[PDB]
């Protein structure tokens, strides 16, 4: 779904498989974070479904022993001197020795300022130990965490369940059409993006000779040239766009290792899974109720959240017993209206839009000899039409799809292509749609605060600040405290600070709250990007200090006070809201749980073979499963006739479904049901098991 999804699917440790424990035999004992996992496997990232704890991911600094053990780097400390030598240890060595803490207060010389430091013992015990006995130390903070979880800012303030949800739901983000970089993040976005393999990078330094939308020619320092081919609108394995746009001009010089072209979810080289959106934390008229999300129509208008999805269709004209299928315009019992979009050879035109129920590839199959009804004979004699002895089976775009047609890849046996035996013609049609954002779509931040889009309001009827800028999204305040994820609040505050720009006024000394702040951070330009690492980042006092200085937008106006709230005006009624409301720029992503992939309906479709019940799933037509619990509720309701209907004349009564359809069409009463074909099958099976079963009347 994105380079993060690919990268995190690599480095994945699965405990289930051939020779490994199965889920049914997986006791609760193995689904635990043993104290030996620190630095070797992420305690946060793991599937939250039935596979909880059986699937994990490697840590960022973890390394694999030749035997297959997982090593972890460490800096060896000698007589209290933290050296720079890195020694890789496994679980046995780590248990044997005594490890320090990553954020131990070193004296900028190698010594510890305080003799008592935090220590992990052999049994996983955490104690305070004099600095003399310590003989190992973590390489850096955020070593225990994986990549996807290390991409979460303000992780140390989040809980564990919501951090798990955010880490698992950062990998399902879809690639948008712009993919702007996040305002506030961690240092594990550039490395994660350039190590994911979805970004073209110049292998040898040189000067850009020719740049275009399809290829880049880098003129190396020594004579030779090299051309890189971008991937324009290539279909990912999960139906997402995979564009690759260059980010260099015709005269730039690039050094071997520089990012030369963006990927699906990248911006200027680093990672970008979503957009930066203005955020409100007020509950608005019950539309953002119980993890419901309100969106401004500006996102729809300017395509802030608009993804491109590419679906492919495959149809093979294959050999048959009664003849050979051919791909041609001549489709039996069809009109010339639907053939307008079809070219001479049968397939649709490139760039010709398609709608649910259209013709994509015209394929005909030899029908054979079959007796026709006398009424059919009379109609054919009346209208003068011939028998048309071949049957029509053409590739029709399924229910609920639209969009243009990008490209057609057609194989043949006559041009010597490697086709499976029995297949004479194969053709692939790629259909792409520009899906907008809409109600029901799933949105989520980086702290696992998910939610579907309840209602997309117009621009005018949304809360706006004093200067008239309307907010873009409206969360709910009740969902923040009970989920223990104020990391979103801290991210919102820091994002507002980054977007507005700040300047620490050191007229009389540097302020005490910013004493430990690094240089070139006391002042920042508007819309500047920051990077708070995972376990060593911006402190709350520093956040307060930054919010104190929030240099005005265009006029003299500080729209956000010290607390981080603002005066919003109700765009529907007009009066200002009586109390300040928190605002800022949170980073949200569009998840791959779109409505168009979920909505389904059925009136009468295909039926199963052995039993006569309808199929299941959206792939076929299929019907919903009326389970045992639903039957229990139906019974408990004092209800009989609805149960009889749903169990007899809707699923299994072979001579009942046609009768009920005819009665509905003609406007007559619904006929009485019959016994179920499934029950008849059960009776036959029992009789086949040498069990004489006889149903008796009296």
């Amino acid at each position: 779904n994105n380079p993060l999804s690919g990268l995190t699917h690599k480095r994945r440790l699965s405990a289930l498989g051939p020779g490994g424990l199965s889920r049914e035999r997986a006791g609760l004992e193995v689904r635990d974070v043993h104290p030996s996992h620190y630095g070797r496997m992420c305690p946060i990232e793991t599937p939250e479904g039935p596979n909880i704890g059986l699937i994990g991911s490697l840590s960022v600094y973890a390394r694999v022993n030749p035997f297959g053990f997982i090593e972890t780097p460490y800096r060896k400390v000698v007589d209290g001197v933290v050296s720079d030598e890195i020694v890789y240890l496994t679980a046995d060595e780590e248990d044997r020795h005594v490890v320090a803490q990553a954020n131990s207060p070193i004296d900028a010389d190698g010594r510890f300022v305080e003799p008592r430091v935090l220590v992990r013992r052999k049994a996983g015990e955490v104690e305070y130990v004099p600095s003399s006995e310590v003989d190992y130390m973590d390489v850096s903070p955020r070593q225990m965490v994986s990549v996807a979880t290390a991409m979460i800012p303000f992780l140390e303030h989040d809980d564990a369940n919501r951090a798990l949800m955010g880490a698992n739901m950062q990998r399902q983000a879809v690639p948008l059409v712009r993919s702007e970089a996040p305002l506030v993040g961690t240092g594990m976005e550039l490395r994660a993006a350039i190590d994911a393999g979805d970004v073209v990078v110049a292998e040898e330094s040189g000067v850009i000779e020719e740049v275009s939308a399809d290829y880049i020619t880098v003129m190396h320092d020594n004579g030779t040239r090299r051309t890189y081919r971008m991937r324009k609108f290539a279909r990912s394995n999960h139906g997402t766009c995979a564009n690759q746009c260059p980010i260099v001009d015709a005269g730039d010089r690039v050094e071997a290792g520089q990012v030369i072209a963006d990927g699906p979810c990248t911006d200027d080289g680093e990672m970008a899974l979503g957009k930066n959106l203005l955020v409100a934390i007020m509950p608005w008229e019950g539309h953002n109720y119980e993890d419901a999300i309100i969106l401004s129509n500006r996102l729809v208008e300017e395509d802030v959240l608009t993804s491109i999805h590419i679906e492919e269709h495959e149809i093979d004209a294959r050999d048959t017993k009664l003849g050979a299928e051919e791909i041609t315009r001549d489709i039996p019992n069809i009109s010339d209206e639907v053939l307008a979009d079809l070219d001479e050879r049968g397939i649709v035109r490139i760039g010709a839009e398609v709608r649910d129920g259209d013709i994509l590839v015209g394929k005909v199959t030899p029908k054979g000899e079959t007796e026709l009804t006398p009424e059919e004979r009379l109609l054919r004699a009346i209208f003068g039409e011939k028998a048309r002895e071949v049957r029509d089976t053409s590739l029709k775009v399924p229910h609920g799809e639209s969009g243009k047609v990008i490209g057609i890849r057609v194989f043949s046996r006559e041009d010597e292509d490697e086709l499976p035996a029995g297949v004479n013609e194969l053709v692939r049609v790629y259909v792409a749609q520009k899906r907008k954002i809409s109600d029901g779509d799933k949105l989520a931040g980086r702290h696992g605060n998910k939610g579907v889009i309840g209602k997309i309001l117009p621009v005018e009827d949304m809360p706006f600040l004093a200067d008239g800028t309307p907010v873009d999204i409206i969360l709910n305040t009740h969902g923040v405290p009970r989920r223990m994820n104020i990391g979103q609040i801290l991210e919102t505050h820091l994002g507002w600070c980054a977007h507005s720009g700040w300047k620490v006024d050191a007229a009389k000394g540097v302020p005490d709250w910013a004493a430990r702040l690094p240089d070139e951070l006391l002042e920042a330009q508007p819309n500047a990007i920051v990077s708070t690492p995972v376990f060593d980042g911006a402190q709350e006092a520093e956040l307060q200090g930054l919010l104190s200085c929030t240099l005005p937008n265009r006029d003299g106006d500080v729209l956000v006070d010290a607390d981080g709230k603002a005066m919003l005006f109700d765009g529907r009624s007009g009066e200002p809201f009586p109390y300040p409301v928190t605002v800022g720029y949170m980073y949200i992503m569009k998840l791959h749980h779109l409505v168009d992939d979920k909505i389904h309906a059925r009136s009468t479709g295909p039926y199963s073979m052995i039993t006569q019940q309808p199929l299941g799933g959206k792939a076929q037509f299929g019907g919903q499963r009326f389970g045992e619990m639903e039957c229990w509720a139906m019974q408990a309701y004092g209800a009989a006739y609805t149960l009889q209907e749903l169990l007899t004349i809707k699923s299994d009564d072979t001579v009942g479904r046609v009768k009920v359809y005819e009665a509905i069409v003609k406007g007559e009463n619904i006929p009485e049901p019959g016994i179920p074909e499934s029950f008849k099958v059960l009776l036959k099976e029992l009789q086949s098991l040498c069990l004489n079963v006889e149903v008796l009347s009296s």
Partner: peptide, 21 residues
């Protein structure tokens, strides 16, 4: 740093790290 075309993303990190990813 350590990436030639890395955009200037100012960091809040307090302590240096010896080992790169």
């Amino acid at each position: 740093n350590s990436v030639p075309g890395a955009p200037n993303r100012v960091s809040f990190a307090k302590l240096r790290e010896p080992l790169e990813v």
